[PDB]
Coordinates of C-alpha atoms and ligand atoms in Angstrom, one line a residue:
Chain A
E1 CA 23.5 6.9 12.0
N2 CA 21.8 10.2 12.4
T3 CA 21.0 10.7 8.4
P4 CA 17.1 11.6 7.8
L5 CA 15.5 8.9 6.2
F6 CA 13.8 12.0 4.2
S7 CA 14.0 15.5 4.0
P8 CA 13.2 17.4 7.1
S9 CA 10.9 20.0 4.4
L10 CA 8.6 17.5 3.8
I11 CA 7.4 18.0 8.0
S12 CA 5.0 20.4 8.4
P13 CA 5.9 23.3 10.0
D14 CA 2.2 24.4 11.0
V15 CA 2.5 20.9 13.1
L16 CA 5.6 21.4 14.4
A17 CA 4.4 25.4 15.4
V18 CA 1.5 23.4 17.5
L19 CA 3.0 20.6 19.4
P20 CA 3.4 20.9 22.9
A21 CA 6.6 22.6 24.2
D22 CA 10.2 20.6 23.9
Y23 CA 8.3 18.0 21.5
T24 CA 8.8 17.4 17.4
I25 CA 8.3 15.8 15.0
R26 CA 11.4 14.2 12.7
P27 CA 11.7 11.6 9.9
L28 CA 13.6 7.9 11.3
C29 CA 16.8 7.7 11.6
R30 CA 19.0 4.3 12.1
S31 CA 20.0 5.3 15.9
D32 CA 16.2 5.4 16.6
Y33 CA 16.1 1.5 17.2
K34 CA 17.9 2.8 20.6
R35 CA 15.7 5.5 21.2
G36 CA 12.5 3.0 21.9
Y37 CA 10.9 2.8 18.4
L38 CA 9.8 -0.7 18.1
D39 CA 8.4 -0.3 22.3
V40 CA 6.0 2.3 20.6
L41 CA 4.7 -0.3 18.1
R42 CA 4.2 -2.4 21.0
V43 CA 0.4 -1.0 21.5
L44 CA -0.5 -1.5 17.8
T45 CA 0.1 -5.3 17.6
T46 CA 3.0 -8.0 18.0
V47 CA 6.4 -6.5 17.0
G48 CA 8.0 -10.0 17.6
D49 CA 11.9 -10.2 18.7
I50 CA 13.9 -7.7 16.4
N51 CA 17.9 -7.6 16.8
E52 CA 19.8 -4.8 15.6
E53 CA 21.3 -6.6 12.7
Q54 CA 17.8 -7.2 11.2
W55 CA 17.0 -3.6 12.1
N56 CA 20.0 -2.5 10.2
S57 CA 19.2 -4.7 7.2
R58 CA 15.0 -3.9 6.7
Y59 CA 16.0 0.2 7.5
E60 CA 18.2 0.0 4.5
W61 CA 15.6 -1.7 2.3
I62 CA 13.5 1.2 3.2
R63 CA 16.2 4.0 2.7
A64 CA 16.7 2.7 -0.4
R65 CA 13.2 3.6 -1.2
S66 CA 12.6 6.5 0.9
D67 CA 10.7 8.0 -1.9
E68 CA 7.9 5.3 -1.3
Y69 CA 8.1 5.1 2.6
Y70 CA 8.2 8.3 4.9
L71 CA 8.4 7.1 8.4
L72 CA 8.0 9.7 11.1
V73 CA 8.5 9.6 15.0
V74 CA 7.3 12.3 17.7
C75 CA 10.2 12.8 20.3
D76 CA 9.2 13.8 23.7
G77 CA 11.5 16.8 26.0
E78 CA 14.1 13.9 26.3
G79 CA 14.7 12.9 23.1
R80 CA 12.5 9.2 23.8
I81 CA 10.1 8.5 20.6
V82 CA 6.6 8.6 22.0
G83 CA 4.8 8.1 18.6
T84 CA 5.3 6.8 15.4
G85 CA 3.6 7.1 11.7
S86 CA 3.9 5.9 8.1
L87 CA 2.7 7.2 4.7
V88 CA 3.8 4.5 1.6
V89 CA 3.1 6.4 -1.7
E90 CA 1.3 4.2 -4.2
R91 CA 2.3 4.7 -8.0
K92 CA -0.6 4.0 -10.2
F93 CA -1.5 4.0 -14.0
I94 CA -4.7 5.2 -13.2
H95 CA -5.5 9.2 -12.6
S96 CA -3.0 10.2 -15.2
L97 CA 0.1 7.8 -13.3
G98 CA -1.5 8.9 -10.0
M99 CA -0.3 8.6 -6.7
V100 CA -2.0 7.2 -3.4
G101 CA -1.0 8.2 0.1
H102 CA -1.4 5.4 2.7
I103 CA -1.2 5.8 6.2
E104 CA 0.0 2.8 8.3
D105 CA 1.1 1.7 11.8
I106 CA 0.0 5.1 14.0
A107 CA 1.0 4.4 17.3
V108 CA 1.0 6.5 20.6
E109 CA 2.8 5.1 23.3
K110 CA -0.3 4.6 26.3
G111 CA 1.2 7.4 29.0
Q112 CA 1.3 9.8 26.2
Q113 CA -2.2 9.1 24.6
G114 CA -5.2 11.9 24.7
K115 CA -2.8 15.1 23.6
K116 CA -3.2 15.4 20.5
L117 CA 0.2 13.4 19.6
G118 CA -2.0 11.3 17.1
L119 CA -3.6 13.6 15.4
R120 CA -0.1 15.9 14.7
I121 CA 1.0 12.7 13.6
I122 CA -2.0 12.4 10.7
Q123 CA -1.4 16.3 10.2
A124 CA 1.8 15.8 9.6
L125 CA 1.4 12.6 7.4
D126 CA -1.2 14.4 5.0
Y127 CA 1.4 17.4 4.7
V128 CA 3.8 15.1 3.4
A129 CA 1.1 13.2 0.8
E130 CA -0.2 16.7 -0.4
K131 CA 3.6 18.0 -1.1
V132 CA 4.5 15.0 -2.8
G133 CA 1.3 15.3 -4.7
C134 CA -1.1 12.3 -4.1
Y135 CA -4.5 12.8 -5.4
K136 CA -5.6 11.6 -2.0
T137 CA -5.0 9.7 1.6
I138 CA -6.7 6.5 2.5
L139 CA -6.4 4.2 5.4
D140 CA -8.1 1.2 7.1
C141 CA -9.2 1.0 10.7
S142 CA -11.5 -0.8 13.4
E143 CA -15.1 0.3 14.3
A144 CA -13.4 0.7 17.5
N145 CA -10.7 3.9 16.1
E146 CA -13.3 5.2 13.6
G147 CA -14.2 8.7 15.6
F148 CA -10.1 9.6 15.9
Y149 CA -9.9 9.2 11.9
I150 CA -13.3 11.5 11.8
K151 CA -11.9 13.9 14.2
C152 CA -8.7 13.8 11.9
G153 CA -10.6 15.1 8.8
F154 CA -11.4 11.6 7.1
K155 CA -14.5 10.0 6.1
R156 CA -15.7 6.5 5.5
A157 CA -15.2 5.4 1.5
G158 CA -15.2 1.5 1.9
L159 CA -14.6 -1.7 3.3
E160 CA -11.5 -3.4 4.3
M161 CA -11.1 -7.3 3.2
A162 CA -8.6 -9.5 4.5
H163 CA -7.4 -13.1 3.6
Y164 CA -4.4 -14.7 6.1
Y165 CA -2.3 -17.6 5.7
Chain B
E1 CA 10.4 -5.3 -25.1
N2 CA 8.5 -8.5 -24.2
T3 CA 10.8 -9.3 -20.6
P4 CA 8.2 -10.2 -18.3
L5 CA 7.7 -7.7 -15.4
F6 CA 8.8 -10.5 -12.5
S7 CA 9.0 -14.2 -13.0
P8 CA 6.8 -16.5 -14.5
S9 CA 7.5 -18.9 -12.1
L10 CA 5.1 -16.4 -9.7
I11 CA 1.7 -17.5 -12.3
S12 CA -0.3 -20.0 -10.1
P13 CA -0.1 -23.2 -12.3
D14 CA -3.8 -24.5 -10.9
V15 CA -4.9 -21.1 -12.2
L16 CA -3.6 -21.5 -15.8
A17 CA -5.0 -25.2 -15.6
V18 CA -8.3 -24.0 -15.1
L19 CA -8.9 -21.1 -17.3
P20 CA -11.1 -20.8 -20.0
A21 CA -9.2 -22.8 -23.1
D22 CA -6.7 -20.3 -24.9
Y23 CA -6.6 -18.0 -22.2
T24 CA -3.7 -17.3 -20.1
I25 CA -2.6 -15.1 -17.0
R26 CA 1.1 -13.9 -16.9
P27 CA 3.2 -10.7 -16.0
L28 CA 2.8 -7.5 -17.5
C29 CA 5.5 -6.5 -19.9
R30 CA 6.2 -2.8 -21.4
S31 CA 4.6 -3.9 -25.0
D32 CA 1.5 -4.3 -23.2
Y33 CA 0.7 -0.6 -23.8
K34 CA -0.2 -1.6 -27.1
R35 CA -2.3 -5.0 -26.1
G36 CA -5.3 -2.5 -24.0
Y37 CA -3.7 -2.9 -21.2
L38 CA -5.1 0.8 -20.2
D39 CA -8.6 0.1 -22.1
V40 CA -9.0 -2.6 -19.3
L41 CA -8.3 -0.1 -16.8
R42 CA -11.1 2.4 -17.9
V43 CA -13.9 0.1 -16.5
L44 CA -12.4 0.4 -12.9
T45 CA -12.2 4.7 -13.4
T46 CA -10.4 7.5 -14.9
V47 CA -7.3 6.8 -16.7
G48 CA -7.2 10.3 -17.9
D49 CA -4.6 10.4 -21.4
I50 CA -1.4 8.2 -21.1
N51 CA 1.1 8.9 -24.5
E52 CA 3.8 5.6 -24.6
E53 CA 7.0 7.7 -23.5
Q54 CA 4.9 8.8 -20.1
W55 CA 4.3 4.6 -19.9
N56 CA 7.6 3.9 -20.6
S57 CA 8.7 6.2 -17.8
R58 CA 6.1 4.6 -15.2
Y59 CA 6.7 1.0 -16.5
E60 CA 10.8 1.5 -15.8
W61 CA 10.1 3.2 -12.3
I62 CA 8.0 -0.2 -11.2
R63 CA 10.4 -2.5 -12.9
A64 CA 13.2 -1.0 -10.7
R65 CA 10.6 -2.3 -8.0
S66 CA 9.4 -5.5 -9.5
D67 CA 10.1 -7.1 -5.8
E68 CA 7.0 -4.7 -4.6
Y69 CA 4.9 -4.3 -7.5
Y70 CA 3.2 -7.7 -9.5
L71 CA 1.0 -6.5 -12.0
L72 CA -0.2 -9.2 -14.4
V73 CA -2.4 -9.7 -17.1
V74 CA -5.6 -11.9 -18.5
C75 CA -5.3 -12.4 -22.4
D76 CA -7.8 -14.0 -24.4
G77 CA -7.1 -16.5 -27.4
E78 CA -6.2 -14.1 -29.8
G79 CA -3.2 -12.3 -27.3
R80 CA -5.7 -9.1 -26.1
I81 CA -5.6 -8.0 -22.3
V82 CA -9.4 -8.6 -21.4
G83 CA -8.3 -8.3 -17.2
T84 CA -5.4 -7.0 -15.3
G85 CA -4.6 -7.3 -11.6
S86 CA -2.0 -5.7 -9.0
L87 CA -0.2 -7.1 -5.7
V88 CA 1.9 -4.8 -4.1
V89 CA 4.0 -6.0 -1.0
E90 CA 4.5 -3.8 1.7
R91 CA 7.5 -3.9 4.0
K92 CA 6.8 -3.6 8.0
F93 CA 8.8 -3.5 11.1
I94 CA 5.8 -5.3 12.9
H95 CA 4.9 -9.3 12.6
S96 CA 9.1 -10.1 13.0
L97 CA 9.7 -7.7 9.7
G98 CA 6.3 -9.1 8.3
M99 CA 5.2 -8.0 4.5
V100 CA 1.3 -7.2 4.0
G101 CA 0.2 -8.2 0.4
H102 CA -2.1 -5.4 -1.0
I103 CA -4.4 -6.2 -3.5
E104 CA -5.2 -3.6 -6.0
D105 CA -6.9 -2.1 -9.4
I106 CA -9.1 -5.2 -10.4
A107 CA -10.9 -5.1 -13.8
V108 CA -12.0 -7.3 -16.3
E109 CA -13.1 -5.8 -19.9
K110 CA -17.5 -5.8 -19.6
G111 CA -18.1 -8.2 -23.0
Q112 CA -15.6 -10.8 -20.4
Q113 CA -17.1 -10.3 -17.2
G114 CA -19.0 -13.0 -14.9
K115 CA -16.9 -15.8 -16.4
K116 CA -14.9 -16.0 -13.3
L117 CA -11.8 -14.1 -15.1
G118 CA -12.3 -11.7 -11.5
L119 CA -11.9 -14.9 -9.6
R120 CA -8.8 -16.4 -11.1
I121 CA -6.9 -13.1 -11.5
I122 CA -7.9 -13.2 -7.5
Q123 CA -6.6 -16.3 -7.0
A124 CA -3.3 -15.7 -8.5
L125 CA -2.4 -12.8 -6.7
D126 CA -3.1 -15.0 -3.7
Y127 CA -0.7 -17.5 -5.0
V128 CA 1.9 -14.6 -5.6
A129 CA 1.7 -13.6 -1.7
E130 CA 1.8 -16.3 -0.3
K131 CA 5.0 -17.5 -2.4
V132 CA 6.8 -14.3 -1.7
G133 CA 6.1 -14.6 2.0
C134 CA 3.1 -12.1 3.3
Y135 CA 1.1 -12.8 6.1
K136 CA -1.9 -11.4 4.8
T137 CA -3.5 -9.8 2.2
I138 CA -5.7 -7.4 2.3
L139 CA -8.0 -4.6 -0.2
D140 CA -10.2 -1.9 -0.2
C141 CA -13.8 -2.6 -1.8
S142 CA -17.7 -0.8 -2.3
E143 CA -20.8 -2.6 -1.1
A144 CA -21.6 -3.2 -4.5
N145 CA -18.7 -5.4 -4.7
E146 CA -18.0 -6.9 -1.5
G147 CA -19.9 -9.6 -2.4
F148 CA -17.5 -11.2 -5.2
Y149 CA -14.4 -10.6 -2.5
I150 CA -16.5 -13.1 -0.2
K151 CA -17.1 -15.4 -2.9
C152 CA -12.7 -15.1 -3.6
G153 CA -12.8 -16.0 0.2
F154 CA -11.9 -12.7 1.7
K155 CA -13.6 -11.7 4.9
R156 CA -14.9 -7.9 6.2
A157 CA -12.1 -6.9 8.4
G158 CA -12.9 -3.0 8.9
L159 CA -13.3 0.5 7.3
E160 CA -11.3 2.0 4.5
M161 CA -11.0 5.7 5.4
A162 CA -10.1 8.5 2.8
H163 CA -9.3 12.6 2.4
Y164 CA -9.4 14.0 -0.6
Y165 CA -6.9 16.7 -1.9
Ligands
ACO201 C1 -4.2 3.3 10.5 C2 -3.9 3.0 11.7 O1 -2.9 2.6 12.0 S1 -5.2 2.5 12.6 C3 -4.3 2.1 14.2 C4 -4.4 3.1 15.0 N1 -3.3 2.8 16.0 C5 -4.0 2.2 17.2 O2 -5.5 1.8 17.3 C6 -3.4 2.1 18.5 C7 -3.2 2.3 19.6 N2 -4.2 3.9 19.7 C8 -3.0 4.6 19.7 O3 -1.8 4.8 19.5 C9 -3.8 6.1 20.0 O4 -4.6 6.2 20.9 C10 -4.3 6.6 18.7 C11 -3.1 6.7 17.8 C12 -5.4 5.9 18.1 C13 -4.8 7.9 18.9 O5 -3.5 9.1 19.6 P1 -3.9 9.6 20.5 O6 -2.6 10.8 20.7 O7 -4.3 8.8 21.8 O8 -5.1 10.7 20.2 P2 -5.2 12.2 20.2 O9 -5.4 12.6 21.5 O10 -4.7 12.8 19.2 O11 -6.7 12.3 19.5 C14 -7.5 13.2 18.6 C15 -8.8 13.4 19.4 O12 -9.6 11.9 19.0 C16 -9.9 11.5 20.0 N3 -9.8 10.2 20.1 C17 -8.6 9.5 20.3 N4 -8.6 7.9 19.9 C18 -10.0 7.5 19.8 C19 -11.0 6.8 19.6 N5 -10.3 5.2 19.9 N6 -12.4 7.0 19.4 C20 -12.7 8.2 19.5 N7 -12.3 9.3 19.3 C21 -10.8 9.5 19.9 C22 -9.2 12.2 21.3 O13 -9.8 12.0 22.5 C23 -9.3 13.4 20.6 O14 -10.3 14.3 20.6 P3 -10.6 16.0 20.8 O15 -10.1 16.4 19.4 O16 -12.4 15.9 21.1 O17 -9.5 15.8 22.0
ACO202 C1 -9.5 -4.6 -5.0 C2 -10.2 -3.8 -6.1 O1 -9.5 -3.4 -6.9 S1 -11.6 -3.8 -6.0 C3 -12.5 -2.9 -7.4 C4 -12.8 -4.0 -8.4 N1 -13.1 -3.6 -9.6 C5 -14.3 -3.2 -10.4 O2 -15.3 -2.9 -9.5 C6 -14.3 -2.8 -11.5 C7 -15.6 -3.4 -12.4 N2 -16.0 -5.0 -12.1 C8 -14.9 -5.8 -12.6 O3 -14.0 -5.4 -13.2 C9 -15.1 -7.2 -12.4 O4 -16.7 -7.3 -12.4 C10 -14.8 -7.8 -11.1 C11 -13.2 -7.9 -11.0 C12 -15.1 -7.0 -9.8 C13 -15.4 -9.4 -11.1 O5 -14.8 -10.1 -11.9 P1 -16.0 -10.8 -13.0 O6 -14.7 -11.8 -14.0 O7 -17.0 -10.1 -13.2 O8 -16.1 -12.0 -11.8 P2 -16.2 -13.4 -11.8 O9 -17.1 -14.0 -12.8 O10 -14.8 -13.9 -11.6 O11 -17.4 -13.9 -10.3 C14 -16.6 -14.5 -9.2 C15 -18.3 -14.9 -8.9 O12 -18.4 -13.7 -7.9 C16 -19.5 -13.2 -8.6 N3 -19.7 -11.5 -9.0 C17 -19.0 -10.8 -9.2 N4 -19.2 -9.8 -9.1 C18 -19.8 -9.5 -8.2 C19 -20.7 -8.2 -7.5 N5 -20.1 -7.1 -7.7 N6 -21.4 -8.9 -6.3 C20 -21.7 -10.2 -5.6 N7 -21.2 -11.0 -6.9 C21 -20.4 -10.9 -7.9 C22 -19.7 -13.5 -9.9 O13 -21.2 -13.7 -10.4 C23 -19.6 -15.1 -9.6 O14 -20.1 -16.1 -8.9 P3 -20.5 -17.4 -9.1 O15 -18.9 -18.0 -8.4 O16 -21.5 -17.8 -8.2 O17 -20.3 -17.9 -10.5
N3Q203 O1 -4.9 2.0 3.3 C1 -3.7 1.6 2.9 C2 -4.2 -0.1 2.8 N1 -4.0 -0.4 1.1 C3 -5.2 -0.3 0.7 C4 -5.2 -1.9 0.0 O2 -4.7 -2.7 1.0 C5 -2.2 -0.2 0.7 C6 -1.4 -0.1 1.7 C7 0.1 0.2 1.3 CL1 1.1 0.2 2.6 C8 0.1 0.2 -0.1 C9 1.5 -0.1 -0.7 N2 2.6 -0.8 -0.3 N3 3.8 -0.3 -0.8 C10 3.2 0.6 -1.9 N4 2.0 1.1 -1.7 C11 -0.7 -0.3 -0.9 CL2 -0.8 -0.5 -2.9 C12 -2.2 -0.2 -0.4
G6P204 O1 -1.5 -6.6 13.4 P1 -2.5 -6.6 11.6 O2 -3.8 -7.7 12.2 O3 -2.1 -6.3 10.9 O4 -2.8 -4.8 12.3 C1 -2.1 -3.9 13.0 C2 -2.5 -2.6 12.0 O5 -2.0 -2.3 10.6 C3 -2.4 -1.5 10.0 O6 -1.7 -0.2 10.3 C4 -3.8 -1.2 10.1 O7 -3.9 0.1 9.6 C5 -4.5 -1.0 11.3 O8 -5.7 -1.4 10.8 C6 -3.9 -2.3 12.0 O9 -4.5 -2.4 13.0
G6P205 O1 -10.3 6.1 -8.4 P1 -10.2 5.8 -7.0 O2 -11.6 6.3 -6.3 O3 -9.3 6.0 -6.8 O4 -10.9 4.0 -7.1 C1 -10.0 3.4 -7.9 C2 -10.2 2.0 -7.2 O5 -8.5 2.3 -6.5 C3 -8.4 1.2 -5.7 O6 -8.0 -0.4 -6.2 C4 -9.7 0.6 -4.8 O7 -9.3 -1.3 -4.6 C5 -11.0 0.5 -5.5 O8 -11.8 0.1 -4.2 C6 -11.1 1.7 -6.0 O9 -12.3 1.7 -7.0

């Protein structure tokens, strides 16, 4: 299936305009399993082993929530996935039933790093978040990659704390 | 309506066992609008103005997702809400289609602070997260409240970064 996860109208036109020639940013679709999506996530952390039937199940759970999960991909000239980025919109009671944008799982293929593809992904995810009416966008990072997020216009706002099971 | 948001079986029995006499922790229900729920959230940040019809709409959106949004309350001997705590379970592709527990919007009524109610809320939310199969629980905090989260068993794991709109 080639049906976008969410509306292509949510993709930043200004970002599309300034990508390198023949590169694009678009919503995830189900067939992206075959276009090297999970490969790109291997630069981020352990993906483990995921067959197409498991893919299709998780894809459908997410599609049943395309009003929360905004997953998009960067594609090169040859339609290969070279970049990934997620926004998850949390609904709150606070801030007059406000909404918070959470940026997750930003990855660019090693051979493709250092070309602004990460920046375009963040600019696209910030465009989605503003447009669906989030009051702020937040994310968690390491010391080692804080400087990328500063170059994207993010500011330090507190501490991530964790409990492992 | 007095129907729990989620199954009371997800409430930590060990936490219920050690609360102060006549205090309880239970899932949110829709009638909690009248039991001072939003009052408690006033200690956390701006709630703004929220009528019962807006409450009912947001409550129903969340109930349509009680497999993601685990909101629970602490009640005193007189059935007043004195504490609130949220877990939101993110679905991932990474970690073999893993799940991450996000702790949000922890609040205890000022007159009721310093009695372990915050600790019981975190222990209850960590019980939910393990039980539905999260690989870790994370949250964002300030320097000023990092020491509460350390006493709860959390460790510093990175930086929260933010963009405001
Ligand atoms: C919320 C999260 O998901 S945090 C997890 C982030 N992901 C990872 O760490 C996975 C591994 N790394 C990557 O996949 C990528 O390198 C990313 C996404 C961090 C950055 O993407 P790239 O395409 O490599 O970066 P891009 O070229 O857009 O960088 C923008 C600017 O930041 C700089 N930059 C990139 N990474 C870093 C860094 N770690 N520290 C400081 N500066 C950096 C670039 O040099 C560029 O600088 P310029 O504007 O002065 O040219
Ligand atoms: C993920 C998030 O939501 S972060 C936002 C947190 N919420 C807020 O900041 C709102 C305002 N504060 C509150 O509502 C509450 O005070 C809470 C939730 C922070 C803590 O709840 P309380 O019921 O006050 O704390 P509780 O009594 O369970 O505290 C556990 C221990 O931590 C201590 N503690 C409580 N707050 C702090 C703090 N800010 N710094 C250091 N230690 C603290 C207590 O003294 C207690 O110590 P002990 O085990 O040595 O007795
Ligand atoms: O900054 C993103 C990390 N957080 C904050 C606390 O862990 C986060 C991430 C997601 Cl993806 C979510 C979320 N998950 N589903 C809906 N929203 C929430 Cl509440 C918080
Ligand atoms: O595999 P983990 O330990 O969860 O880390 C994987 C990544 O997930 C999230 O998107 C966080 O923003 C990153 O800080 C983290 O690098
Ligand atoms: O009103 P905000 O600026 O979003 O802050 C309100 C709270 O929301 C979240 O639960 C965060 O964990 C806290 O760090 C923050 O205090």
